């Protein structure tokens, strides 16, 4: 039947990618000088969480950040004075992700419950209240990011993604091309395309307005846990449980560089790029985080000091500091 | 010195910290458990009989109180068959109450495999598991009927004897007791294959209508509490 057609199409795609492959990223970029040893110091230490922190997100002002822990509380941290700005109590304690609006007026959250809760931080009474509840998914929400003050994309464990309108509250665009549970997604700088990785050992690119899959990169051998976009909007790095990070390019449609080590046999939990994209940070299950060279594939630095599994990483817009959240209910700012 | 805005921010942070401590008091006073089991395991019966909202809800919570101690049991709702990802969220739970049908000889072995996924998990390796062998009356009726033979599914049952520490209930057939203890030992071998002291199993026989099970769970949790207080103080 058509299974042979799918097989021959995949073979043709693989042959085309092999023909378009001239040289690896490590061979062409071998003439440059390495960065060297990166030694980042802890500037601020955030304490106060109860359960294990699962995700965080930085703001556009590079001052305030949002932290989400499984105790049922969203905490707004000040990166400068370490002061708590807002404490939003959640109806469901088993949350897994959080999102900060670009304007700083709304904050989204979700988790095992198939409901994305958006809270308004600019209420006329100075407090925070439930502003919107988006329901309709049939799986746990893994990650969500804001595109504007009226629309938001969400990835759920039902192998589908949905673009919700804050004003209306219904699914405007649905993506069902994935096979496994979508674990994370990253938005492009122009908010036109976004890559999302699922538990099917493959990631897919989707359009916000077109609502169709553009390209698919398998690359890995296990479930992809996190994914982050390159600052230029043309590449993206993915981390999986096989202890190997892989950089793919949307324009090249092939794998660029693989970051791995022999002594590393632990999966990747979160990845993020700096402002320039030269350094790639990745949290591992070995209670430590590693910053590799995106152009040389060498271990540039180790941000050790966490007493539990590293859960989330976050780089500011200006790349002046990096927040690391682990299951020890503490956030650490490194610079 | 700090400005007025800085003082206001410090006061707000202090109020938020006080609220967080007030919430942490209740969070520490309340215990959390994770209920797991197959479709025919009878989880709906255990969720009910609690003597103390959307259609696509993926998590259900049942709050009850035993001996002035609050327990919140969480059950998986509208979720797919893949569980290797979201179950990692339950790494900090007090106990996992896993239900197993005692009469369903077909899926029993399958349940055993599932039990392995709960025991040999790299994230659930330090979490206690309370085994509920549900539907004991159905098992007794099926054993008294004699239509189905356990040897057709488990041949080692033909070479199994009653343990010495067995406690037969007053008014129970010997074959039912033999099958019950055989299933118990089959679960205990899989549990102790990788226990190594860091975690233990809590076997409990559950019938159709039992109101004391929760209380038993309480005792179990109590034991867990001790097993979490002796390793910190340095005595176990």
């Amino acid at each position, epitope marked *: 039947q058509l299974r042979q057609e799918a097989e021959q199409l995949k073979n043709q795609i693989r042959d085309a990618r092999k023909a378009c492959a001239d040289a690896t990223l490590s061979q062409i970029t071998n003439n440059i000088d390495p960065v060297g040893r990166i030694q980042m110091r802890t500037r601020r230490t955030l304490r106060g969480h109860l359960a294990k922190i699962y995700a965080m997100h930085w703001g556009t002002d590079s001052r305030l950040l949002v932290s989400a822990s499984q105790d049922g509380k969203l905490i707004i941290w000040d990166s400068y004075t370490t002061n708590k700005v807002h404490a939003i109590p959640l109806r469901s304690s088993w949350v897994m992700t959080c999102a900060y609006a670009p304007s700083g007026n709304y904050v989204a959250c979700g988790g095992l419950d198939n409901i994305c809760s958006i809270y308004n931080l600019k209420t006329r009474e100075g407090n925070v209240r439930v502003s919107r509840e988006l329901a309709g998914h049939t799986g746990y929400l893994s990650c969500c990011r804001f595109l504007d003050d009226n629309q938001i994309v969400t990835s759920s464990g039902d192998t589908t993604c949905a673009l919700w309108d804050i004003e209306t509250g219904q699914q405007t665009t649905t993506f069902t091309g994935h096979t496994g549970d979508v674990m994370s997604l990253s938005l492009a700088p122009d908010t036109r395309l976004f890559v999302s990785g699922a*538990c099917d050992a493959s990631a897919k690119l989707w359009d916000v307005r077109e609502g169709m899959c553009r390209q698919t990169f398998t690359g890995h051998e*296990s479930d992809i846990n996190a994914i982050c976009f390159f600052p230029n909007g043309n590449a993206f790095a993915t981390g999986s*449980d096989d202890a190997t990070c892989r950089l793919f390019d949307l324009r090249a449609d092939q794998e660029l560089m693989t970051y791995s080590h022999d002594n590393i046999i632990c999966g990747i939990t979160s990845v993020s790029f700096s402002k320039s994209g030269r350094l790639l940070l990745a949290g591992y299950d070995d209670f430590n985080c590693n910053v590799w060279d995106a152009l040389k594939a060498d271990r540039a630095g180790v941000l050790a000091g966490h007493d539990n599994r590293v859960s989330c990483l976050g780089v500011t817009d200006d790349g002046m500091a990096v927040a690391t959240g682990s299951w020890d209910s503490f956030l650490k700012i490194w610079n | 010195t700090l400005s007025a805005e800085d003082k206001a921010a410090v006061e707000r942070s202090k109020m938020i910290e006080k609220q967080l401590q007030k919430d942490k008091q209740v969070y520490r006073a309340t215990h959390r458990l994770l209920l797991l089991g197959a479709d025919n395991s009878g989880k709906s019966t255990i969720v009910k009989q609690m003597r103390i909202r959307v259609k696509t809800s993926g998590i259900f919570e049942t709050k009850f109180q035993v001996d002035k101690v609050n327990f919140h049991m969480f059950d998986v709702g509208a979720q*797919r068959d*893949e*569980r290797r990802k979201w179950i990692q969220c339950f790494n900090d739970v007090t106990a996992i109450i896993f239900v197993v049908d005692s009469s369903d000889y077909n899926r029993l072995q*399958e349940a055993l495999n599932d039990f392995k996924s709960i025991w040999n*998990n790299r994230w659930l390796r330090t979490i206690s598991v309370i085994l509920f062998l549900n539907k004991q009356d159905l098992l007794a009726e099926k054993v008294l009927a004699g239509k189905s033979k356990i040897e057709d599914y488990f041949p080692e049952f033909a070479r199994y004897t009653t343990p010495e520490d067995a406690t037969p209930e007053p008014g129970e057939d010997p074959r039912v007791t033999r099958a019950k203890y055989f299933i118990r030992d089959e679960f205990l071998r899989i549990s102790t294959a990788s226990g190594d002291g860091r975690h233990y199993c809590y076997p409990h026989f559950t019938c159709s209508v039992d109101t004391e099970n929760a209380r038993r769970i309480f005792n179990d949790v109590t034991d867990i509490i001790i097993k979490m207080n002796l390793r910190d103080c340095g005595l176990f």
Partner: nanobody, 125 residues
Framework: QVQLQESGGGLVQPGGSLRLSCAAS????????MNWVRQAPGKGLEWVSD????????SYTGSVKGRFTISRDNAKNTLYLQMNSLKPEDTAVYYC?????????????????????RGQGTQVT
């Protein structure tokens, strides 16, 4: 891309013998735990056997314990399963599952209906 190709199934009279072979591609065969499961017509997915990376830990289900034997070939990266003394109730489609996380021993989601790291299966009668 992860790919599992199973072969060796066919029409066999009750009491014969078979040698199923599963070839893996797209990942390291020696660094993952393998499992063989079966699906009967009208019934759900049933686990049959499992073998670890180094082949030291091998386990079988109570239904086929003593009759089937599973083995690995890291040089050829092939999973072999010799089935002897076939029974009429053993007629089922056999599938090969691979553990999602490397260097682990928990076989999670190996019996799920939708699993990416599992081949299309072969007909065995």
């Amino acid at each position: 891309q992860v790919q599992l190709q199973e072969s060796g199934g066919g029409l066999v009279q009750p009491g014969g013998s078979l040698r199923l072979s599963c070839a893996a591609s797209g990942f390291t065969f020696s660094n993952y735990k393998m499992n063989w499961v079966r699906q009967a017509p009208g019934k759900g997915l049933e686990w049959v056997s499992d073998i670890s990376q180094s082949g030291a830990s091998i386990s079988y289900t109570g239904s086929v314990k003593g009759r089937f034997t599973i083995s690995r070939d890291n040089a050829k990266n092939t999973l072999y399963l010799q089935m002897n003394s076939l029974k009429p109730e053993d007629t089922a489609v056999y599938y090969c599952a691979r553990c999602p996380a490397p260097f682990t021993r928990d076989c999670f989601d190996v019996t799920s209906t939708t699993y990416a790291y599992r081949g299309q299966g072969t007909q065995v009668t």
